[PDB]
Ligand binder design. Structure first.
Ligand SMILES: *[C@@H]1O[C@H](CO)[C@@H](O[C@@H]2O[C@H](CO)[C@@H](O)[C@H](O)[C@H]2NC(C)=O)[C@H](O)[C@H]1NC(C)=O
Ligand SMILES: *[C@@H]1O[C@H](CO)[C@@H](O[C@@H]2O[C@H](CO)[C@@H](O)[C@H](O)[C@H]2NC(C)=O)[C@H](O)[C@H]1NC(C)=O
Ligand SMILES: OC[C@H]1O[C@@H](O)[C@@H](O)[C@@H](O)[C@@H]1O
Ligand SMILES: [Cu+2]
Ligand SMILES: [Cu+2]
Ligand SMILES: [Cu+2]
Length: 495
């Protein structure tokens, strides 16, 4: 509804998405954060005005525009102390980037510590006027965006270091155990019409098993990548993933439960928990529909891209320029990858590079940075392990889409027409989720666990892609160059 040129004013205030009042983060004076829209190829100019006054939730901020490649604008990507120093309170900062060659469903969120769980997270849609799937539906608009989120009665820094959610919010509304009368979200449809629903996980932690009673879902886009249509009766969506699906409103006029079962916390629907309403003329009451067993669940390995794009490289293990293996571990309240835990360096990784760092051994933090050759194919395997609790861990690679040559719960490799996405579950112990991508994008890019409570615990690495070309490819605006001095002048209590 706003965008692609717009102000985003960040402030604190009370919210009660589940009928419980708590302090949170507001964006343009609303919770949940508003939807931003634009079209394929557009210039986005989003002026993030930081007016937050609460240090427990951090007065500083940084926004990541999730899914966008940010080619030439690595400075605008969002990660605190990788791509910028945070915006300090009482200051504004403009993210000015372009979206060539990308269309689909995205989201924005704070990429500073675990701040996005406190409410700074909203959907984004980039419309394609020549969408390959335009003819599959009649309605695609603001009312067809569906967001899922985890919600906590105690703030990120206040509750447990890995808290259990009190509520699942669908379009920013849901019920908790003790607010079973709280307003549910209503998604309205007219019989005979076909809907492009755009489902985005704003989750800080849980994955949801998503279904709609009595309806099938035709999946046509995954993480901003066009798919071949693939009809399922349920899907597991992980933190930060998006799916577009077509729903044909061809059932009896009625109310139907929209369901989102989290993999932890309250794992049922008693009293309308973890649920929203699909309303056809139907009575303005709750659904009384029954969940039938899922007989045709989404399987990631059975998805493919619309074009049938092959994976980069030659169809064999290690058949690439550089293959890397990320071994997960956990020691001392810290997650590790190849023995190293991520602690945000004081000089942002991009700034280190611009300032003359030439290699990964130069780059801080030590052991957390990987140099990547220019214009190459890369293969990364992320084998799951019990040695890193709270699996399955979804990983996200910034500045890039990747081929999922191997998925969780699959034994097979697919080099010929694998799905392409940007957030992938690494699965349960025994899996070896494996991805490949092209180094077509000079700059430092976070690769990390998108469960945010684990990202605090350092479950992250940085891909330092084409170091020699980072400065030339990524000219930075003077406002970017003023972020660090301004942030370093702040006292800890104002951070
Ligand atoms: C700033 O935000 C924090 C974190 O949300 C608020 O923390 C609350 O602290 C009170 C009083 O100590 C507790 O009873 C609440 O349970 C906390 N809320 C949450 C969500 O954890 C704090 O109130 C905020 N500061 C101001 C001035 O509003
Ligand atoms: C997960 O997959 C990776 C990549 O195939 C495996 O790493 C390779 O292991 C073989 C045999 O030990 C070696 O030839 C290579 O050096 C490894 N490739 C690297 C490091 O890039 C890894 O062992 C697999 N893990 C599990 C648990 O199956
Ligand atoms: O920090 C949480 C605190 O919040 C207060 O409002 C009360 O609910 C206390 O029981 C609790 O200790
Ligand atoms: Cu993200
Ligand atoms: Cu994790
Ligand atoms: Cu990230």
């Amino acid at each position: 509804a706003i965008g692609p040129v717009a102000d985003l004013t960040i402030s604190n205030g009370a919210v009660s998405p589940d009928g419980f009042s708590r302090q949170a983060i507001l964006v343009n004076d609303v919770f949940p954060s508003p939807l931003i829209t634009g079209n394929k190829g557009d210039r986005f100019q989003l002026n993030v005005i930081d007016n937050m006054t609460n240090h427990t939730m951090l007065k500083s901020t940084s926004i990541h525009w999730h899914g966008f490649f940010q080619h030439g604008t690595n400075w605008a990507d969002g990660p605190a102390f990788v791509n910028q120093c945070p915006i300090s309170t009482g200051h504004a900062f403009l993210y000015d980037f372009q979206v060539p060659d990308q269309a689909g469903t995205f989201w924005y969120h704070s990429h500073l510590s675990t701040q996005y769980c406190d409410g700074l997270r909203g959907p984004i849609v980039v419309y394609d006027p020549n969408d390959p799937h335009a003819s599959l539906y009649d309605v695609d608009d603001d009312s067809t965006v569906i967001t899922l989120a985890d919600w906590y009665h105690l703030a990120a820094k206040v509750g447990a270091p890995v808290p259990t959610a009190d509520a699942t919010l669908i379009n920013g509304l849901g019920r908790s155990a003790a607010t079973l009368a709280a307003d549910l979200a209503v998604i309205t449809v007219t019989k005979g019409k076909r809907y492009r629903f755009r489902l985005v996980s704003l989750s800080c932690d849980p994955n949801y098993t998503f279904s709609i009673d009595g309806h099938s879902l035709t999946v046509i886009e995954a993480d901003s990548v066009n798919l071949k249509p693939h009809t399922v009766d349920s899907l597991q969506i992980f933190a930060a993933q998006r799916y577009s699906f077509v729903l044909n409103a061809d059932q009896d006029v009625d109310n139907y439960w929209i369901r989102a079962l989290p993999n932890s916390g309250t794992q049922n629907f008693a009293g309308g928990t973890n649920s929203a309403i699909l309303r056809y003329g139907a009575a303005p009451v709750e659904p009384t529909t029954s969940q039938t067993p899922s007989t045709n669940p989404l399987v990631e390995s059975a998805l493919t891209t619309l074009k049938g794009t092959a994976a980069p490289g030659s169809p064999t293990p290690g058949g690439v320029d550089l293959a890397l293996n990320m071994a997960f571990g956990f020691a001392g309240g810290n997650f590790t990858i190849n023995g190293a835990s991520f602690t945000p360096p004081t000089v942002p990784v991009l700034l280190q590079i611009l300032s003359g760092a030439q290699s990964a051994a130069d780059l801080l933090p030590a052991g957390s940075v990987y140099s990547l050759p220019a214009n190459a194919d890369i293969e990364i395997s992320l084998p799951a392990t019990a040695a890193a609790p709270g699996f399955p861990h979804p990983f996200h690679l910034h500045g890039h889409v990747f081929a999922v040559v191997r998925s969780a719960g699959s034994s097979t490799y697919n080099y010929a027409n694998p799905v392409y996405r940007d957030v992938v579950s690494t699965g349960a112990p025994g899996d070896n989720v494996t991805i490949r991508f092209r180094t077509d994008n000079p700059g430092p890019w976070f690769l990390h666990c998108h469960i945010d409570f684990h990202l605090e615990a350092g479950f992250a690495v940085v891909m330092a892609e084409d170091i020699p070309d980072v400065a030339a490819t990524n000219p930075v605006p003077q406002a970017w160059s003023d972020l660090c001095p301004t942030y370093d002048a702040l006292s800890p209590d104002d951070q």
